[PDB]
Structure 1
Amino acid sequence: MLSERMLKALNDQLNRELYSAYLYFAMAAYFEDLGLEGFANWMKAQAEEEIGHALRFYNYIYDRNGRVELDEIPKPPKEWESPLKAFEAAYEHEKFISKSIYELAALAEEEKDYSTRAFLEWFINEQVEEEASVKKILDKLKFAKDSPQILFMLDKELSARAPKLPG
C-alpha cells in the first residue's frame, strides 16, 4: 500500500530532515565559535526539531507497512560570512525543504495516495511556520546592519529557546 516510488520519496525526505538537523547543528557550532551562545542554543533547538520531523516520516512509513532505509548524511558547510548570511542560508534551506514537500504532495496526488497526501498536510503547515520563524530573525539581522549592540541583544532573546535534550 505504499508504491515502490513513494517509499523512495518518503525515505528520501526522512534523509533530508536529518540533513536539515545536521545543518542546524553546523550552524550552532558556527554561532558557538562567534561566542553568540543564544543563537547557538536556538540552532540546537532547531536541530532537535528536525530530528522530530524525521521521526514523523519514520512513523508514517511504518504505519503504511513500509521499511525505512537510512542514507548517508552529507557533510554540511562549516561556516558563513556573518550571522545574517547563516540565516539567509537557513531561509534558502527551508525554501528548499518546502519544495520537496510540494513535490511529495504532487506525487501523492498523481498516485491517488490519499493517506500520504494527508500525512503531508502537516508538513505543508509546519513549513509555513518554519520559514516565518527563520524569516523573522533574518530581518532583525538585516535591521541590525552595523550594530553589534543589537546583535548582542537578539542573542539574549534567542537564548530563551533551549534544546530539550542535554538535561
Structure 2
Amino acid sequence: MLSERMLKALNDQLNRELYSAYLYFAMAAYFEDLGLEGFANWMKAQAEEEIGHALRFYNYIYDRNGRVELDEIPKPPKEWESPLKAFEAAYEHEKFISKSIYELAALAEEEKDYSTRAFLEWFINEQVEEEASVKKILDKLKFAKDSPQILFMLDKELSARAPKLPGLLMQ
C-alpha cells in the first residue's frame, strides 16, 4: 500500500504524461498548419505513446491498491517561431519529464519503496530513447537553417511514423 505522498507523486506524473500527449497533439496542429503532414503524423504517433505511459501509471497505482485521481490538463502553447523552435521546446520538455521521473525514483529510494522504484525503471530506460529520438530530429533542423529543400525531405522521412489508433475506431 502506497504512502499518501507517493500516491500523489504517481498521480501527478500520470497528469504530466497526459499533458505530454496534449502538448504533442498541439505540436501536431502547428505542423499541420504549415502543411507538414509528416511532422504532424509523427507528433500524433508520439502523443499516443504518452497516453500509453499514463495508462502504465494508472495500472500500477491500482496494482498497489491505490486510487487514481485525474487533475485538469492545462492549455498547451498554440504557436512556435519555427519547426526548429518547436523541437527545441519538445526536447526541453522531454528533459522536464525525465527530471520529474528522477525525483520520483529519489523519493522511492528515500521511502524504501522498492516496488515503485522497480516500476520506474521502465520509464528511466524509456526516456533515454525518447530524448535521443527528439534530439536526432532537432539536430537535423539545425542542419537545415535556411533550406526548405531539406525540410521537405525530412517531412517525407517522418511520414513513415503514423498514429495507430485512427484506423481502429468507429469507421
TM over 0.5: yes
Shift of 1:81: 0.1
Shift of 1:86: 0.3
CA deviation string 1:15-44 (max 9, x = no partner):
000000000000000000000000000000
Give the distance between the partners of 1:132 and 1:106, measured in 2 at CA.
Answer: 23
CA deviation string 1:58-102 (max 9, x = no partner):
000000000000000010000100000000000000000000000
DSSP 3-state at the match of 2:2: coil
* Structure 1: segments with no counterpart, 5+ residues: none
Shift of 1:153: 0.2
Shift of 1:116: 0.1
Equivalent residue number for residue 160 of structure 1 = 160
Give the distance between the partners of 2:7 and 2:114, measured in 1 at CA.
Answer: 14
Give the distance between the partners of 1:155 and 1:163, measured in 2 at CA.
Answer: 15
CA RMSD, Structure 1 to Structure 2 (Å): 0.3
Structure 1 residue ranges (4+ consecutive) displaced by more than 6 angstroms after TM superposition:
none
Q: How does 1:67-146 map onto structure 2 within 5 Å?
A: 67-146=67-146
Percent identity at matched positions?
100
CA deviation string 1:95-151 (max 9, x = no partner):
000000000000000000000000000000000001000000000000011100000
Give the distance between the partners of 1:54 and 1:44, measured in 2 at CA.
Answer: 16
Give the distance between the partners of 2:61 and 2:68, measured in 1 at CA.
Answer: 7
* Structure 2: segments with no counterpart, 5+ residues: none
Shift of 1:164: 0.2
Equivalent residue number for residue 11 of structure 1 = 11
Shift of 1:12: 0.2
